[PDB]
From Swiss-Prot, chain B:
Main location: cytoplasm
Main function: Chaperone for the type III secretion of Tir. Probably stabilizes the protein, prevents inappropriate protein-protein interactions and aids in secretion.
Organism, scientific name: Escherichia coli
Protein name: Tir chaperone
UniProt keyword annotations, A-Z: Chaperone, Cytoplasm, Virulence
Gene Ontology cellular component list: cytoplasm
SUPFAM superfamilies assigned: Type III secretory system chaperone-like
Gene Ontology biological-process annotations: protein secretion by the type III secretion system
Family from the record: Belongs to the CesT/SycH chaperone family.
Subcellular localization, as worded in the UniProt entry: Cytoplasm
Length: 144, 141
């Protein structure tokens, strides 16, 4: 109806297509925030975990400062360091991982710490409208 | 009258701010130059304390600077760990490190204060070896 016409006109404009309300008058969708993590075989005592947050706006100094300021918070609590990797010019959340007494479960938790930091970093940016460059919200329908 | 050597010493002295300088009987004249480091202990919460290395006033006009400091944090991130932070209030460049009270001892507080100092030392040296920048007095020879 006036809805189906919107549901569909929504599809044609959203990229994916052939969308319609099912039997129960529902039309479900899945969306996701994909988080990038990288493990670096740094040296022989430590391993480095990087939470790649996306390209950094290197033309906005006001941003670099609210990031640098956010470190106070990461300095008080847990600890991934907020950094800038010149090469790919990205925003990085860094956390060294000690190999001594290492364990996949410890590695699992340390990686979880970094992603929870990204969660928090993002929420704050999202709640301020900010959106890094390599950020993409992928949508697609599923069985309602 | 004085040799152009003594002359230079004097013009140097008067220009540097200190006054009345000359070469002693041995043709010597010594100075002491200080590189002060400001540390601040903070009674943050009741489970952790916070050691701050106040490095100076952060030039908030330079987009490039902020980025170089952020890139330096990669280094601190690999090593022990004082964080390179920015404090809006005083617009200062901070080197932050938390200190746990559980089993704390002045010895532990002394080591920690000393790591922040050494971090400020690696920082300033990398900053100065870049020409970047955010007290001399004569003494006995």
């Amino acid at each position: 109806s006036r809805s189906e016409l919107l549901l569909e006109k929504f599809a044609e404009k959203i990229g994916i297509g052939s969308i319609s309300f099912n039997e129960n008058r529902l039309c479900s969708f899945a969306i996701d925030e994909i988080y990038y993590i990288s493990l670096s075989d740094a040296n022989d005592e430590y391993m480095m975990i990087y939470g790649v947050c996306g390209k950094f706006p290197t033309d906005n100094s006001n941003f670099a400062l609210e990031i640098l300021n956010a470190n106070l918070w990461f300095a008080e609590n847990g600890g991934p360091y907020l950094c800038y990797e010149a090469g790919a010019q990205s925003l990085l959340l860094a956390l060294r991982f000690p190999l001594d007494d290492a364990t996949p479960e410890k590695l699992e938790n340390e990686i979880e710490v970094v992603v929870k930091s990204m969660e928090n970093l993002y929420l704050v940016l999202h709640n301020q409208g900010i959106t890094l460059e390599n950020e993409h919200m992928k949508i697609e329908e599923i069985s309602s």
